[PDB]
RNA sequence: ACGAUCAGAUACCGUCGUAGUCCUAACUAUAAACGAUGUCAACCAAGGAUUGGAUGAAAACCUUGUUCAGAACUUAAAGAGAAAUCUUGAGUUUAUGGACUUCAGGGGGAGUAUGGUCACAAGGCUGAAACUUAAAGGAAU
RNA sequence: AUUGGAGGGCAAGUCUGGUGCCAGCAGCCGCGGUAAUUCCAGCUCCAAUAGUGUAUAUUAAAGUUGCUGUGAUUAAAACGCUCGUAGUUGAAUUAAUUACUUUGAAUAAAAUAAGAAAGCGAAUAUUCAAGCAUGGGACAAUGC
RNA sequence: AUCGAGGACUACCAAGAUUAUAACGGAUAACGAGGAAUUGGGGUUCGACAUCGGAGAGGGAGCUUUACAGAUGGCUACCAC
RNA sequence: UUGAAAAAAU
């Protein structure tokens, strides 16, 4: 390890870079519990 | 009798 | 073998068959330290086309500081110690 | 199927010593005059392996004391 | 249903999707006799899906005849529940040629985890949650949709306990 | 050679139901496998003596992997068509059961096979 | 009849011996 | 080695002819050594004919029935496959697990180098890498 | 406010000037031999954005390493064939250990997950391979 | 002899120990673990580096003092500086 | 009876 202080990522870029059905829907900039529900169901 | 059925692939 | 106690062969079988893998073998046997001009490094400081395409590719020959081997290097752009870093395809 | 040949016979009785009888091994070891009979030699090995498979079995069953070793 | 208007009669407003246009050729003495083959998908989004194929000399003509075949090839899609309708009732696989596409029931939240081509057809059928795995040359579009179409086409044949 | 009677038995049943069926060797596992397949309703010689449109496919699993209770979820998710239809068959310390009572008897053990 | 010692205590060995 | 034919023909065509072709003894251990389909076990649609039985009928040989073993063949609206095709499997495989052994991982370089070992030798067995390249290949129209 | 791009993969011009298989671009398909949707320019819009290109390597894609899970007639791939040791796998049947299985004990923190990135009392549960105690003996292996 | 068990060592006696369930040997661009990256399940790759344990102070070796060192921001000799 | 060859890319 390198540091005692924790850190996290607050987003994840999509797998497919260019898809029209996503460019329109998403359009300042373009910058969990479902599975938690899943595991108990 | 085993003969009665005795007078095959896998 | 499939039986519950035959974990020795399948472990042994897989180890043998991994050596057939071209990509996997290249990263384990000793050529990245003696045959790769770049070694394991990214960049390296140093000092006519195929049939259906005609013209001339301007290129350069470079002698590396560390190994000393001579390699052919392309020039990037139109009308274009040297740092050389591979191409699109790895190796 | 058969132990050595590929034949698969089902001749059986239907209900409503053997090691001795395999030493056949001596009766062909005949090979003295016929030294070129390679058919007999191949079949001699097959009969011998039958003996060693039976020899190994009877020892662990304590039928034969484990000093047994069939020779020529 | 030997007529395409009847499915247009009992299933109005069939939302349309041309999967792709694929140009075939026939070598002859003069040259190549090229025709355009179009795969179209129809079907309301409530358990009815249809796939049809037609090839002709004109793009517009081939599509028009393609909707007919998809209309004629009408099949019901059996939907069900994951644990508690949104997904398939069991695991089904569509046996096209080299392509084998398998449908796995999915929980309420997950979308269509599938390639773009079987997705557009699986959206049409009326499914929203599904897990898919493919086995074969999926770059062959025609066999991809047929493998998808076949997978849902057998959903109403598997006699489960409730049936 | 005949290694597993259970493996031979279930393949005999599937091919018949795909096309009553007969099983020539009978063991302590073959029959009591069926009692699970009969209480789910799926089924109606001195020498180890010798179907209603419902059975889809019954098969055994090669070497009987010890199954923990926590491991039940992985096996059902793999070998069962859905979460409501099929049934595993387990041999446990309290007889041959399936994933229902073995989850209720609070025990694990080896796995025999299944039936949809 | 014990929990399941030699083969001289087993059931069909002793229940035959008992017989 | 001759004679032909041919632009040449050091080959196909014709004639002659050493090694070999045969047997013995010892080596070599490779072939499209192929069913290009490993061995063992259960199940699986419909037929006629066939090689050795045994049990009936019919007077050892021929004609019929019954049940096994063996080499096959015919049909399939079924099963499988990319298809050709396979069906006594190449079926019972994404609805993926009967037991075991061996082999393969894009095409070349290459069955090459080095090393080891067997043979009198030719060679056999084991067997890379550097480097090079977007195809090579299969079945069908 | 930049970075790369505008033929396809992959979102974005069948706009205008030159170059003429040359210079060049292009990770691959390929574009260029004088009318270039790909070159060098000018304009415009496309994705993300204080970030975005390039090279190298790990993982996923890869069911292209296969326990889950591959293929071996013809695409690469069943030893020419049989015997045989080690290995693995081994029919049914019966009213001492080990394996298996259930519970516990015991088990550094940090971290993981959990009761703006952070920070600080979670029952916080791990965390396997072993080892200890325990209820069970159906499937198994070892001799009796 | 050691703080102390023990071929750790010395004298006598014996022929024994391991190995195809991979011994012996070779390679590592090998300090090990807690962990990290990525993952549907299964897994693949990394872990010098926060914390635990190990080892080292240019290379060996020999010592001093002390309760603890084969210490090196202590000594002694050789090699190399 | 003889019967060989067709410069590179579009």
UniProtKB/Swiss-Prot annotation, chain A:
It comes from the Eukaryota. Disulfide bonds: none annotated. Belongs to the universal ribosomal protein uS4 family. This is Small ribosomal subunit protein uS4. It comes from Entamoeba histolytica (strain ATCC 30459 / HM-1:IMSS / ABRM).
Curated annotation (Swiss-Prot), chain B:
It comes from the Eukaryota. It is found in: Cytoplasm. Component of the small ribosomal subunit. Belongs to the eukaryotic ribosomal protein eS27 family. Component of the small ribosomal subunit. The ribosome is a large ribonucleoprotein complex responsible for the synthesis of proteins in the cell. Required for proper rRNA processing and maturation of 18S rRNAs. This is Small ribosomal subunit protein eS27. The lineage of its organism: Eukaryota, Amoebozoa, Evosea, Archamoebae, Mastigamoebida. The gene is RPS27. The chain holds residues 12 to 32 of 84 of the full protein.
